[PDB]
C-alpha cells in the first residue's frame, strides 16, 4: 500500500507487492496445461481471441529441438524470456555440442527473473510459463513464475481457472505417468485435464494448441485442422 | 590535383586552377573546377590527395554557409582565412590528416582591399600579393617578381596571369589541360569563360 | 516517520527498518538447520510438499559452492540462489589468484561484504533470506550462518526459518550432552531428527527430507548429498524419535 | 546502485530562498568563534582549540591550516567539512596553478578555486552544500597582505578585519572600534587575544587558544639554504608559550 | 520532513542521519577502552557471547588491520567489517605507493574522509560505527584516534566508547589528573593491560571471567591479541594484589 | 621531413645594461622555396616577449595559444604576467606534449616590471628551460649563432651598442644558413619603451 | 653530464657539473642540475633534460601534498616509490636517470633509479656520460666512515674526473650537502675551474654600422584613457 | 529509490512556466540594482553593492562588475558565485572564438552563448538554475555600443537604458523619463547615478556603496577603453554630479 | 645474474650474485638480488631489472592484504600470484623469478617461474645466466635432506662455478636461510670463494 511503489521495498510483513502485483497478471491470462510420462512431455493451452473477426493468441514457443513452453500473463514478456532460452539452449550446443538440461534452463530462468526483482527502475515479469522437454534424464515439466521460483513436476496448470485442471490432475497422476509410447494418450489426458477449466465456450479448432516432445519427437506444436483428431 | 595561382592586384583576386583529373594512366577528365565559393566575396581553390580535397572544401563550405546564415553577416577573409588554418593545423595531428593545400581569395568590403592567403595542409598561413601550391611557384614566381606592381589592374593581372601559365605549359611535363580562371571583387566571384 | 520506506535510512532510533521487513520473509520460510560435528558440517532442510505433482527427489534445496561448501537458506529462494552464484565467482576468483580454495571464514565474509552492501544504498533491496553454510578448509570444519543485515557468526549449530525455536532448543541439547563432540554420522541421524521436530509449526502439509555433509573422514572434505540407504536409515531413526 | 541522484538537493523555493544554503549558514552560525585582523604588515587569524574531552589531545586536530607558505585557513561550522575542504585546497593550488606556472597562487585566486568547489556542492547533483566559513589569510608579491571570507554559497569578500561563528555580531563591532590603517602585526595579535577573549568562557590560555600569522619571511623554517631568492615561508603558526607571553602584555 | 532521511541539512543546521547512526553505534550493548604505556598501547572491549549454539573464538570486534594497526569497533558487526576491510585495503595501498607503514593518525584521518563523503553525498548512508585505532607509531610513539560517522577524528592520551563511556572517561581523567602524565609509566605491557582492566572493573561496577573480555596490544612493530589464557593470567594477577 | 628544418628561420635573444634585446629573420619557406619575407618570429604578450623557431604551423598555433592563456591570466590576476612567470607556462605547456610534440625552439626576453632585472630564457621543443645570463639562440642558424655571441658578446651593453652586437650576430649567422634571412627585425627593450628596428640584408 | 652521490657519517652528499648540450653544441655553460624534491630531498638527473625536471618537480609537489597529508616530513623511500613505478608505467620512454638523495625521521639515503623503472641503493654512485671516469675516482678513495669534509672532497674530485675526461661534461661543479638534524645546504658553483680568458679584441662596433630601414616606437601599453 | 527526493527542476507549471525560473527572478529581485545606460559615445554601468561594513576592504572588493574581454564587461544581479562559474565560461569562449577567427568576439554572440547555457538548466539535467541575471555592456565593429541582458531562463534582449535587481520597476520608468536618443555618456553618468540615488533602500547614496564603470571610445583614435572606477574616482563624480 | 633456492632438512636456502650489468659495464657490484615478499617467502631475481623490481613490489602488496584477511600464505599461494602477473604479462616481461619459502606444515618449498609464466615445484632450482654453467654440477651434487652446512657449501661452491664462467655475474654471494628458528643471512667474499 505505502510499500506497493516499486520492486525495491519489502512491507512490514516482508512482502514484496510489485512482485505479487505480476502473479496477478498470469492468473489474468488464459488457461494452459502440461503433464509427463517418461517417454513423452505435453503442452496443452486454450488461446484466447479478442473478438469474432480476430485471431486466437498464441501461447506456446519453440526453444530449440528438444524444449519449449507455453505462457499465460503478458505475452511481450514471454517473448523476453523465451528468446533468453533460445541463446542460453544455443549457447550450449554451440559451445559445449551439448543439449541444454531442462533443470539447467529452469535455473537460468530463475536468476534472470530475480534481478528483476531486487533492483530500482525495473520490474518483475508479468508471465508465468509451463517448459516441457526430453533430455539425457528423460521427460521433464517445469513452471516458472515471475517471483524466480521454478519448480520440477510431473503435471500442472496455470493461469485462469487452472485449479480445475491441477485437481484432475493430481487424481490422474498413477494414470498419465504410466502412458509410456502412446503419444495420443498422453495428449487426451492433456485435452481432458484442461477441459475441467472451460466453463461458457469449448475447445474448437482456432481455440486448442497442442505441443509435445519425448524420445524420438521433435518439439512440435499443432493447430487449427491437426487438432481435430482430439477435439 | 595540380596547378593553383593566385594573384592580388589592385582591386580584386585572381585564382587560376588547372583543369586536369589524372587516375594514374588515364586523364579521366579536363574540364574539372577545383574550388568552391565560401562567401559571396570569397573563394577558395584546393589541391592535393584525391577525395580528402573535396571533401575538405565542401566541409568549409559548409561552415562558413552555416556561419553567414546565424549571424546574417559575412565573415571578413582574413576570420575566413584564420578559421581554415585552425581545421589544418588540427588535422595534421590526427589519425588521418587532409592532405589539402589551399588558396583563399576575398575582397574585403569593410577595408574595400582584396587579399590573398596561401595555407598548406600543416596549417602554414601566409598572406601575400600572389602564390601557389607545389611545383607551380617554381616555374612562375621569377615572373610575379619581376612584373607585379600594387597598382595593377585586373587586365594586367590576367596578362601577368597568361604568362605564368604560358610558362607552366612549356617546361613543366605533365599536360594539365589549361586552367579556369575566376576574379574576386567588390561585385562578388565571376568566371573568365575564355583563357 | 516514514523511516521505513527506503533502506539505507537509519531511523531516529538508529535500525534500518527494510532489514527488518527482509528478516519477516526470513522468518516466512521453511527451516533449515546445519549442525557441526567432529571433522566435518552436515546441513539439512525441510521441502514442503505443495502437491502430490511435485516430482519427489527432483527440486534439490542445498547448494554447492566449489566443491568442499555446502550452502542452504530459507526465505525468498531466488535471493538464497542470487547470493549463491556471487559466492561461487568470489570462490574462483580466490581460488584463480591464490591456487589453494577458499578458506571458510575467508569465504564468509566475501558472502557477509555483499549482503552488507545491499544495505548501503536505497536503489536496493536486502536479501530475503538467512543462510547457513560452511564445510572444511586447512584448519578443520567450519559452520556459519548469515542474516540479511550482512550479520554472521561462526556456530556449534544453527537453524532459521519457521521452525527455528524448536530446532535451536534440539540444537542446544546435544551441544550440552556432547562436550567431546558428534560423529558425522551421529550428526546425519540428529539432523534427520530435528527437522522432522522442527515441521510441527508447518504440519499442515506433508515434507520431504533433505540432508547433506562435508567430512575428512566420510567425504574426504567434499560436500555430498546424503542418498539411498544412509538416508532412508536417518528418516527411519527420526521417525522412531517422533512416536 | 550507482549514485542515481543526478538531480539537485538545493533549489529555490516561491520566496526565492536556497534553503539548504540557508540552513548551511546556520551551522556555521552555531560554530565556535574565529576571526582575522590584517595589519600593514601581516595578518593574523585566530580561534578556540575547544576540546571535545580532557582526555582528547587537542593539539592533534588543527583549526588553523597552512594552505601555502605564504596563506592559510581557519573555519566556524563543521569540522569534518573543513577538514576536506583544506585537503582539496592543498591539491588544487599545485594542480590548476603551482604545475602550471611554477610558483603559489595568490591569495585571491586560491580562495577563488576554494569557492568554485563550494558553489559546485549548491548545485551539482545528489550533494548537499558545505557546513562551513572559511577566513583564509595570506601574502603574495603583487597584492600584498590580504584577508577572505567564503561562505557555503561560494561567495566571497575581502576584509580588513571580521569574525565568523557564535559571537561574530559582537566580535565585529569590537573590531570596528580598535581597526585602523597603521596597525603594526603586534597590535593586530593582541587585538585579536582581546576580542576573542570576550567569546571564551573556560580555560583561556596558549594550549586553548590557536592563533597563526602571514607576516615575514622565516628562513629558519625553510629547511634548507643556499638559493637567494628562496626566504622561506611567511605562514607561521605561534607556540602556546608565545601566546601566554603575550597574555601577561594583554 | 526528508531532510530526517537523507544526509541534507535541516533548518537548524543538522543532519540527522549522522546523528542516527551515533545512535546505531551502542546497538551491541558493548564498551571498550584504550590506554597508553610507555612503550605500548592496550585496548580491551567486552565480550558477549549470549548463544550457547555460537562458536565463541569467532566473535569479535577487535581488527589487525595492519602489522603496528589494530582497531577497535564499536557498533553492528556488518558494519565493522566493512570498515575493517576498507581499512585493510587502505592500509596496504599506502605501503606500495610510498614505500613505508601507514600511521595510525593518517589512517584515522583517511578513514574520517570517507566518512565524512557519506555526510555529504545523499545515495551513501552514514556507517553506524566508532573505530578506535591503536598502535606504536615509529615517529609519534603510542597512538590512540579514533572516528565517528560524523567524520570527526582526533588523538587521545586515552579514551572510552559504548553506553557506558563517560563513567570510564571520568575514572580515567581523575587518574590522569592525579598522575600529571599523559600515559600509564610502566615497563610491561603485561602490567599496562591489568592496568586497563582494573579500571573498567571499578567504572563499570563488575567483575570479569576470562571470556568475558576481548584483549588488543600495540607494541614495536606489532598488535597482536590475547588468548583467553593470557587474560585468565592477567585476571589472576589483579585478584592476588 | 625533419620538421624542425622545413620552414627555417632564426631567433636571438641577448642581455644588456637595464635592458633586452630579441631578433629574428623574416624568412619562411617550403624547403628551397621561399615563400615569405614577412614572417615574423617574435610576438609578445604585454611586456613580455616570445620569439619561436621551427616548423611555421606551430608558431602560429603557439602564439594564438600563449595569447589565449595569457589574456585569461589577466583576467584573473588583474596584472599582466611577468617573464620568469610565462617561461614557466610555456615549458609546462610544451611538456604536456611529451609525446606528440610542437616542433619549435621558443625564446623569451624581457624585464620585470616590479625588479627591474633583464630576463631571458630558452627551451628545448619538450619543454626544458635554458635560463641564460648572456644569451639564447634557436633555429636552423643556432651553431653559427652560438659562434657570434660567443665573441661578439660582452655583458652590461648600453641599449644602443646592444643593438649593434646582436644585429650583427644575426645577419652574419644568417647569411650563412640557406633557409634563414631575408630580411629581420631587432626589438630593443627597455622598462617603458620598446623600439623595432627593420634591418638592412642581402636578400639571396 | 657528471653526477655522483657519497654516504657520510652523519648524512650524505651529491654533486653535479654544470654543462648541457644540443649533440656537440653546449647550449648552457653554467645549468643547474641539482633539482629539490623536497627541503632535505635534493636529486640529479642524466638522460633527458625536461624529463629529469618534469619529474622531478611532480613527485615533488605529489611529495609535499603527502607531507601535508601525513603531518610528517617527506622519506626518501617515498620520493624513490613514487618516482619508479611513473616511470616503469611509461617503459622507459620518459628519459629520467636520477641519483636520490636525502635525510629523513627514519636516516640518510641514497638511491639510483633507472628510466625503466629500476632502483639500486649504495653508499657511493654516478650516473651521466662521465659516470665511468667519477666511478673510477670513487672506486680508488672510498672508504668506509667519511667525515662530512672528506665526502665533499671526494664527491667534488669524482665530478672533476668527468669535467676533464668526458666531453658531455664541464665548466663547474655544484654540491648539495644533506646532513642529519640540519638545514641542508645547497653550494652552486662549489668550484669554478673554467674561466674564460680574457678575448684579445674588443668587438663593440661603432654606432651606426649596421643598415636600418625603418624604426617605430612598439606601444606595449594598453589602451590609455582620455 | 531515488526518486523520491527528487524536486523536479526543469517542469512545467499548468500554467506554462518553469517555476524554479520564476522562483530565481523572485531571488534576484532582491539583489543590489545594477544599471547600464547606452549613449553615442560610450556606455555607462553603475551598481549598488549590498548593505556594506565599514570593516570591508573596498579597493580590493569586486562584487557588481566583472571584466569578459577589453571590450565588454558585464554588471551582476543575483548570487555571486553562480555568475563567477559563468563569467569564467564567457571568459573562455572569448578567448576560443579570438583562437578560431583572429577577431574580437561581436557582443551578440557572446551574449547568446552564455543565455543557450542558463537555457539548457531549464530543460535537462535535473539541476537548479543559476540565480544570476546579467547586463552586459561592449563594443564591437558591427554595432558599435550595444547593451543587452540575459536572465536565469536563458532570454535576451537589447536595450539603450535596463535596469535588474531591486527595484527595476521605479528605476525602469525614470530612466524612461530623462533617457534622450542625441545624450552623450557625461549626461549618462548622471542619469544613472541620480536613478539610483532614488531608487536605493539605503539612507543616502555614498561612493562606498558602489561600483561603476565606462565604455568609451575616449580611448585615442578608433579604440576603446574600459575604466572600472575606483572608490576615489567614484567620490569625486558623486560630488561633481552634485550628489555629496 | 647467477641464482638458486635449495631445500633441505630444516627448511630451504636461496643464493645469488651480486653483478648487474649494462652491457659489460658494472653498474652495481653489491647488488642485493635475495628479495622478501613475506617474511619467511622470498625470492631471487632475474630479467630486466624493473619488471622483477615492479612485479616483487605488487607480489608483496598482495601478501600484505591476504595476510590481514586470510593469515600466512603459502608459498604455493606466493608463487600463484608471481605466476599470474608473469602469465597474463608475458608480452610486456622480461622476468625469470625464484621463489622460495617455509611454512610448519609444508617445510622448505622451491617454485621456479621461467620466461613464460608457467610454474615448476622442485628440490632446487637454478636460473639466471649463470646458471647454464652449473647444470651438471648441481645435478650430480644436490642430495635430498641436506643438513644446513652442507647446502651452504653446495650453494657457495655451485655459485663460485657460476661467477667462474659467466661475465654476467660476480661480486659477493649472498644467502638467506628459511627455517623454524627464523632468518638469517650470510655474505661470503671473493678471497673466500675463488679459492674453493
Ligand atoms: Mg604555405
Ligand atoms: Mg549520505
Ligand atoms: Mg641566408
Ligand atoms: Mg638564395
Ligand atoms: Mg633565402
Ligand atoms: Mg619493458
Ligand atoms: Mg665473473
Not at chain 3, 12 to 34: C, L
Not at chain 5, 125 to 139: K, Y
Not at chain 7, 120 to 132: C, P, R
Not at chain 9, 167 to 189: K, N, P, Q
Amino acid at each position: 500500500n505505502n510499500y506497493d511503489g516499486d520492486t525495491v521495498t519489502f512491507s512490514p510483513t516482508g512482502r514484496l507487492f510489485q512482485v505479487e502485483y505480476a502473479l496477478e497478471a498470469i492468473k489474468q491470462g488464459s488457461v494452459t496445461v502440461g503433464l509427463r510420462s517418461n517417454t513423452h512431455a505435453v503442452l496443452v493451452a486454450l488461446k484466447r481471441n479478442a473478438d469474432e473477426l480476430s485471431s486466437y493468441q498464441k501461447k506456446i514457443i519453440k526453444c530449440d529441438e528438444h524444449m519449449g513452453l507455453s505462457l499465460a500473463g503478458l505475452a511481450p514478456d514471454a517473448r523476453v524470456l523465451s528468446n533468453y532460452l533460445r541463446q542460453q539452449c544455443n549457447y550450449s550446443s554451440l559451445v559445449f555440442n551439448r543439449k541444454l538440461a531442462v533443470e539447467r534452463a529452469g535455473h537460468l530462468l530463475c536468476d534472470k527473473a530475480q534481478k528483476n526483482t531486487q533492483s530500482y527502475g525495473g520490474r518483475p515479469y508479468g508471465v508465468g510459463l509451463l517448459i516441457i522437454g526430453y533430455d539425457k534424464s528423460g521427460a521433464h515439466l517445469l513452471e516458472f513464475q515471475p517471483s524466480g521460483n521454478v519448480t520440477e513436476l510431473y503435471g500442472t496448470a496455470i493461469g485462469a481457472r487452472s485449479q480445475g485442471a491441477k485437481t484432475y490432475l493430481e487424481r490422474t497422476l498413477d494414470t498419465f505417468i504410466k502412458i509410456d509410447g502412446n503419444p495420443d494418450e498422453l495428449i487426451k489426458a492433456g485435452v481432458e485435464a484442461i477441459s475441467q477449466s472451460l466453463r461458457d465456450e469449448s475447445l474448437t479448432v482456432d481455440n486448442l494448441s497442442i505441443a509435445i516432445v519425448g524420445k524420438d519427437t521433435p518439439f512440435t506444436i499443432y493447430d487449427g485442422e491437426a487438432v481435430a483428431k482430439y477435439i | 590535383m595540380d596547378i593553383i595561382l593566385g594573384i592580388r592586384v589592385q582591386d580584386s583576386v585572381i585564382l587560376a586552377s588547372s583543369k586536369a583529373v589524372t587516375r594514374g594512366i588515364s586523364v579521366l577528365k579536363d574540364s574539372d573546377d577545383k574550388t568552391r565559393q565560401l562567401s559571396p566575396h570569397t573563394l577558395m581553390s584546393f589541391a592535393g590527395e584525391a577525395g580528402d580535397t573535396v571533401q575538405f572544401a565542401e566541409y568549409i563550405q559548409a561552415n562558413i554557409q552555416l556561419y553567414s546564415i546565424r549571424e546574417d553577416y559575412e565573415l571578413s577573409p582574413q576570420a575566413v582565412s584564420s578559421f581554415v588554418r585552425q581545421e589544418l593545423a588540427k588535422s595534421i595531428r590526427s589519425r588521418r590528416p587532409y592532405q589539402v593545400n589551399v588558396l583563399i581569395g576575398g575582397y574585403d568590403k569593410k577595408k574595400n582591399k582584396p587579399e590573398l592567403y596561401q595555407i598548406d595542409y600543416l596549417g602554414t598561413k601566409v598572406e601575400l600579393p600572389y602564390g601557389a601550391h607545389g611545383y607551380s611557384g617554381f616555374y612562375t614566381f621569377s615572373l610575379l617578381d619581376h612584373h607585379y606592381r600594387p597598382d595593377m589592374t585586373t587586365e594586367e593581372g590576367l596578362d601577368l596571369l597568361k604568362l605564368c601559365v604560358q610558362e607552366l605549359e612549356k617546361r613543366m611535363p605533365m599536360d594539365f589541360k589549361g586552367v579556369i580562371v575566376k576574379i574576386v571583387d567588390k561585385d562578388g566571384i565571376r568566371q573568365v569563360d575564355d583563357f | 516517520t516514514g523511516y521505513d520506506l527506503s533502506n539505507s535510512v537509519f531511523s531516529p532510533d538508529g535500525r534500518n527498518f527494510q532489514v527488518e521487513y527482509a528478516v519477516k520473509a526470513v522468518e516466512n520460510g521453511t527451516t533449515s538447520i546445519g549442525i557441526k560435528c567432529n571433522d566435518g558440517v552436515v546441513f539439512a532442510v525441510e521441502k514442503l510438499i505443495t502437491s502430490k505433482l511435485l516430482v519427489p527427489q527432483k527440486n534439490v534445496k542445498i547448494q554447492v559452492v566449489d566443491r568442499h561448501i555446502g550452502c542452504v537458506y530459507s526465505g525468498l529462494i531466488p535471493d538464497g540462489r542470487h547470493l549463491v552464484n556471487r559466492g561461487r565467482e568470489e570462490a574462483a576468483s580466490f581460488k584463480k589468484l591464490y591456487k589453494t580454495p577458499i578458506p571458510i571464514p575467508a569465504f564468509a565474509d566475501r558472502l557477509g561484504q555483499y549482503v552488507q552492501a545491499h544495505t548501503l544504498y536505497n536503489s536496493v533491496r536486502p536479501f530475503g533470506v538467512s543462510t547457513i553454510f560452511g564445510g572444511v578448509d586447512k584448519n578443520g570444519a567450519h559452520l556459519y550462518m548469515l542474516e540479511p543485515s550482512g550479520s554472521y557468526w561462526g556456530y556449534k549449530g544453527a537453524a532459521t526459518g519457521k521452525g527455528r525455536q524448536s530446532a535451536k532448543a534440539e540444537l542446544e541439547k546435544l551441544v550440552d550432552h556432547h562436550p567431546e563432540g558428534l560423529s558425522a554420522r551421529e550428526a546425519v541421524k540428529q539432523a534427520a531428527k530435528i527437522i522432522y521436530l522442527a515441521h510441527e509449526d508447518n504440519k499442515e502439509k506433508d515434507f520431504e527430507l533433505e540432508i547433506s555433509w562435508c567430512s575428512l573422514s566420510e567425504t574426504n572434505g567434499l560436500h555430498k548429498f546424503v542418498k539411498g540407504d544412509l538416508l532412508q536409515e536417518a528418516i527411519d531413526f527420526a521417525q522412531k524419535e517422533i512416536n | 546502485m550507482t549514485d542515481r541522484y543526478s538531480f539537485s538537493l538545493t533549489t529555490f523555493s516561491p520566496s526565492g530562498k536556497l534553503g539548504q544554503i540557508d540552513y548551511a549558514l546556520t551551522a556555521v552560525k552555531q560554530g565556535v568563534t574565529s576571526l582575522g585582523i590584517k595589519a600593514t604588515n601581516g595578518v593574523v587569524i585566530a580561534t578556540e582549540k575547544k576540546s571535545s574531552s580532557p582526555l582528547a589531545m587537542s593539539e592533534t586536530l588543527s583549526k588553523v591550516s597552512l594552505l601555502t607558505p605564504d596563506i592559510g585557513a581557519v573555519y566556524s561550522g563543521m569540522g569534518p567539512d573543513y577538514r576536506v575542504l583544506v585537503d582539496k585546497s592543498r591539491k588544487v593550488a599545485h594542480t590548476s596553478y603551482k604545475r602550471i606556472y611554477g610558483e603559489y597562487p595568490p591569495t585571491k585566486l586560491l580562495v577563488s578555486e576554494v569557492a568554485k568547489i563550494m558553489q559546485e556542492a549548491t548545485q551539482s547533483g545528489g550533494v548537499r552544500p558545505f557546513g562551513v566559513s572559511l577566513l583564509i589569510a595570506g601574502h603574495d608579491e603583487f597584492n600584498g597582505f590580504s584577508l577572505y571570507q567564503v561562505d557555503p554559497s561560494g561567495s566571497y569578500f575581502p576584509w580588513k578585519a571580521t569574525a565568523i561563528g557564535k559571537g561574530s555580531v559582537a566580535a565585529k563591532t569590537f573590531l570596528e572600534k580598535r581597526w585602523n590603517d597603521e596597525l603594526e602585526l603586534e597590535d593586530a595579535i593582541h587585538i585579536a587575544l582581546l576580542t576573542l577573549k570576550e567569546s571564551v568562557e573556560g580555560e583561556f590560555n596558549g594550549d586553548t587558544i590557536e592563533l597563526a600569522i602571514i607576516g615575514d619571511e622565516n628562513p629558519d623554517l625553510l629547511g634548507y639554504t643556499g638559493i637567494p631568492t628562496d626566504k622561506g615561508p611567511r605562514f607561521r603558526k605561534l607556540t602556546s608559550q608565545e601566546i601566554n607571553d603575550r597574555l601577561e602584555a594583554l | 520532513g526528508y531532510d530526517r532521511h537523507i544526509t541534507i541539512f535541516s533548518p537548524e543546521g543538522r543532519l540527522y542521519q549522522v546523528e542516527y547512526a551515533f545512535k546505531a553505534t551502542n546497538q551491541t550493548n558493548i564498551n571498550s577502552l584504550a590506554v597508553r604505556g610507555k612503550d605500548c598501547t592496550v585496548v580491551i572491549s567486552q565480550k558477549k557471547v549470549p548463544d550457547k549454539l555460537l562458536d565463541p573464538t569467532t566473535v569479535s570486534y577487535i581488527f589487525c588491520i595492519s602489522r603496528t594497526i589494530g582497531m577497535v569497533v564499536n557498533g553492528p558487526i556488518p558494519d565493522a567489517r566493512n570498515a575493517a576491510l576498507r581499512a585493510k585495503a587502505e592500509a596496504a595501498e599506502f605501503r606500495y605507493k610510498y614505500g613505508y607503514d601507514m600511521p595510525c593518525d593518517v589512517l584515522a584521518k583517511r578513514m574520517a574522509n570517507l566518512s565524512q563523503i557519506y555526510t555529504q553525498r545523499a545515495y551513501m548512508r552514514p556507517l553506524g560505527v566508532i573505530l578506535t585505532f591503536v598502535s606504536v607509531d615509529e615517529e609519534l610513539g603510542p597512538s590512540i584516534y579514533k572516528t565517528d560517522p560524523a567524520g570527526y577524528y582526533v588523538g587521545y592520551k586515552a579514551t572510552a566508547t559504548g553506553p557506558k563511556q563517560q563513567e570510564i572517561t571520568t575514572n580515567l581523567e581523575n587518574h590522569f589528573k592525579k598522575s600529571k602524565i599523559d600515559h600509564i609509566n610502566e615497563e610491561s605491557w603485561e602490567k599496562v593491560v591489568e592496568f586497563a582492566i582494573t579500571h573498567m572493573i571499578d567504572a563499570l561496577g563488575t567483575e570479569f571471567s576470562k571470556n568475558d573480555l576481548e584483549v588488543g596490544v600495540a607494541t614495536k612493530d606489532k598488535f597482536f591479541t590475547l588468548s583467553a589464557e593470557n587474560i585468565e593470567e592477567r585476571l589472576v594477577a589483579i585478584a592476588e594484589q | 621531413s625533419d620538421p624542425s628544418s622545413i620552414n627555417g628561420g632564426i631567433v636571438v635573444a641577448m642581455t644588456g645594461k637595464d635592458c633586452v634585446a630579441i631578433a629574428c629573420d623574416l624568412r619562411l619557406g617550403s624547403q628551397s622555396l621561399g615563400v615569405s619575407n614577412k614572417f615574423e618570429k617574435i610576438f609578445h604578450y604585454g611586456h613580455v616577449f616570445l620569439g619561436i623557431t621551427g616548423l611555421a604551423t606551430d608558431v602560429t598555433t603557439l602564439n594564438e595559444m600563449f595569447r589565449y592563456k595569457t589574456n585569461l591570466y589577466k583576467l584573473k590576476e588583474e596584472r599582466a604576467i611577468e617573464p620568469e612567470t610565462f617561461t614557466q607556462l610555456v615549458s609546462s605547456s610544451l611538456y604536456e606534449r611529451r609525446f606528440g610534440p610542437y616542433f619549435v625552439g621558443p625564446v623569451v626576453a624581457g624585464i620585470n616590471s616590479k625588479s627591474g632585472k633583464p630576463f631571458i630564457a630558452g627551451f628545448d621543443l619538450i619543454g626544458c628551460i635554458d635560463e641564460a645570463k648572456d644569451f639564447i639562440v634557436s633555429g636552423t642558424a643556432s651553431d653559427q649563432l652560438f659562434g657570434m655571441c660567443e665573441s661578439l658578446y660582452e655583458p652590461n651593453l648600453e641599449p644602443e651598442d646592444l643593438f649593434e652586437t646582436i644585429s650583427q650576430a644575426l645577419l652574419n649567422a644568417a647569411d650563412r644558413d640557406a633557409l634563414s634571412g631575408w630580411g629581420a627585425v631587432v626589438y630593443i627593450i627597455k622598462k617603458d619603451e620598446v623600439v623595432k628596428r627593420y634591418l638592412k640584408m642581402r636578400q639571396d | 653530464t657528471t653526477i655522483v652521490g657519497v654516504k657520510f657519517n652523519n648524512g650524505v652528499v651529491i654533486a653535479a657539473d654544470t654543462r648541457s648540450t644540443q649533440g656537440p653544441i653546449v647550449a648552457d655553460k653554467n645549468c643547474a642540475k641539482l633539482h629539490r624534491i623536497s627541503p632535505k630531498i635534493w636529486c640529479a638527473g642524466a638522460g633527458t633534460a625536461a624529463d629529469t625536471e618534469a619529474v622531478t618537480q611532480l613527485i615533488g609537489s605529489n611529495i609535499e601534498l603527502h607531507s601535508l597529508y601525513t603531518s610528517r616530513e617527506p622519506r626518501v623511500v617515498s620520493a624513490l616509490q613514487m618516482l619508479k613505478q611513473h616511470l616503469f608505467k611509461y617503459q622507459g620512454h620518459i628519459g629520467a636517470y636520477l641519483i636520490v638523495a636525502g635525510v629523513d625521521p627514519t636516516g640518510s639515503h641514497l638511491f639510483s633509479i633507472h628510466a625503466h623503472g629500476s632502483t639500486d641503493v649504495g653508499y657511493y654512485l654516478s650516473l651521466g656520460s662521465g659516470s665511468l671516469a667519477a666511478m673510477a675516482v670513487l672506486e680508488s678513495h672510498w672508504k668506509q666512515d667519511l667525515t662530512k669534509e672528506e665526502a665533499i672532497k671526494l664527491a667534488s674530485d669524482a665530478i672533476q674526473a668527468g669535467i676533464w675526461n668526458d666531453l658531455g661534461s664541464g665548466s663547474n661543479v655544484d654540491v648539495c650537502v644533506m646532513e642529519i638534524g640540519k638545514d641542508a645546504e645547497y653550494l652552486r658553483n662549489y668550484l669554478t675551474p673554467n674561466v674564460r680568458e680574457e678575448k684579445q679584441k674588443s668587438y663593440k662596433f661603432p654606432r651606426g654600422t649596421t643598415a636600418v630601414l625603418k624604426e617605430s616606437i612598439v606601444n606595449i601599453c594598453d589602451i590609455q584613457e582620455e | 529509490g531515488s526518486r523520491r527526493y527528487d524536486s523536479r527542476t526543469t517542469i512545467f507549471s499548468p500554467e506554462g512556466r518553469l517555476y524554479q525560473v520564476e522562483y530565481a527572478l523572485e531571488s534576484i529581485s532582491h539583489a543590489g540594482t545594477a544599471i547600464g545606460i547606452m549613449a553615442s559615445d560610450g556606455i555607462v554601468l553603475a551598481a549598488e553593492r549590498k548593505v556594506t561594513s565599514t570593516l570591508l576592504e573596498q579597493d580590493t572588493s569586486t562584487e557588481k562588475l566583472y571584466k569578459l574581454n577589453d571590450k565588454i564587461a558585464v554588471a551582476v544581479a543575483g548570487l555571486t558565485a553562480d555568475a563567477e562559474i559563468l563569467i569564467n565560461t564567457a571568459r573562455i569562449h572569448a578567448q576560443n572564438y579570438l583562437k578560431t577567427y583572429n577577431e574580437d568576439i561581436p557582443v551578440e554572440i557572446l551574449v547568446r552563448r552564455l543565455s543557450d547555457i542558463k537555457q539548457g538548466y531549464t530543460q535537462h539535467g535535473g539541476l537548479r538554475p543559476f540565480g544570476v541575471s546579467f547586463i552586459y555592456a561592449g563594443y564591437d565593429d558591427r554595432y558599435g555600443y550595444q547593451l543587452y541582458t540575459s536572465n536565469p531562463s536563458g532570454n535576451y534582449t537589447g536595450w539603450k537604458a535596463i535596469s535588474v535587481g531591486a527595484n527595476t520597476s521605479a528605476a525602469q520608468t525614470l530612466l524612461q523619463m530623462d533617457y534622450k536618443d542625441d545624450m552623450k555618456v557625461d549626461d549618462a553618468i548622471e542619469l544613472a547615478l541620480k536613478t539610483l540615488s532614488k531608487t536605493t533602500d539605503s539612507s543616502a547614496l555614498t561612493y562606498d556603496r558602489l561600483e561603476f564603470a565606462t565604455i568609451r571610445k575616449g580611448a585615442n583614435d578608433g579604440e576603446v577603453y574600459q575604466k572600472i572606477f575606483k572608490p576615489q574616482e567614484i567620490k569625486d563624480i558623486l560630488v561633481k554630479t552634485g550628489i555629496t | 645474474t647467477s641464482i638458486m633456492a635449495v631445500t633441505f632438512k630444516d627448511g630451504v636456502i636461496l643464493g645469488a650474485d651480486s653483478r648487474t650489468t649494462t652491457g659489460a659495464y658494472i653498474a652495481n657490484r653489491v647488488t642485493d638480488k635475495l628479495t622478501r615478499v613475506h617474511d619467511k617467502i622470498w625470492c631471487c631475481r632475474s630479467g630486466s631489472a624493473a619488471d622483477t623490481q615492479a612485479i616483487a613490489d605488487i607480489v608483496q602488496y598482495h601478501l600484505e592484504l591476504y595476510t590481514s584477511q586470510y593469515g600466512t600464505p603459502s608459498t604455493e599461494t606466493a608463487a600463484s600470484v608471481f605466476k599470474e602477473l608473469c602469465y597474463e604479462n608475458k608480452d610486456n616481461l622480461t622476468a625469470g623469478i625464484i621463489v622460495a619459502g617455509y611454512d610448519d606444515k609444508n617445510k622448505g618449498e622451491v617454485y621456479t617461474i621461467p620466461l613464460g609464466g608457467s610454474v615448476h615445484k622442485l628440490p632446487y632450482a637454478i636460473a639466471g645466466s649463470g646458471s647454464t654453467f652449473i647444470y651438471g654440477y648441481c645435478d650430480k651434487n644436490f642430495r635430498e635432506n641436506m643438513s644446513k652446512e652442507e647446502t651452504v657449501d653446495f650453494i657457495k661452491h655451485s655459485l663460485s662455478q657460476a661467477i667462474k664462467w659467466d661475465g654476467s655475474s660476480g661480486g659477493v654471494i649472498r644467502m638467506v636461510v628459511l627455517t623454524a628458528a627464523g632468518v638469517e643471512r650470510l655474505i661470503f667474499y671473493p678471497d673466500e670463494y675463488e679459492q674453493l
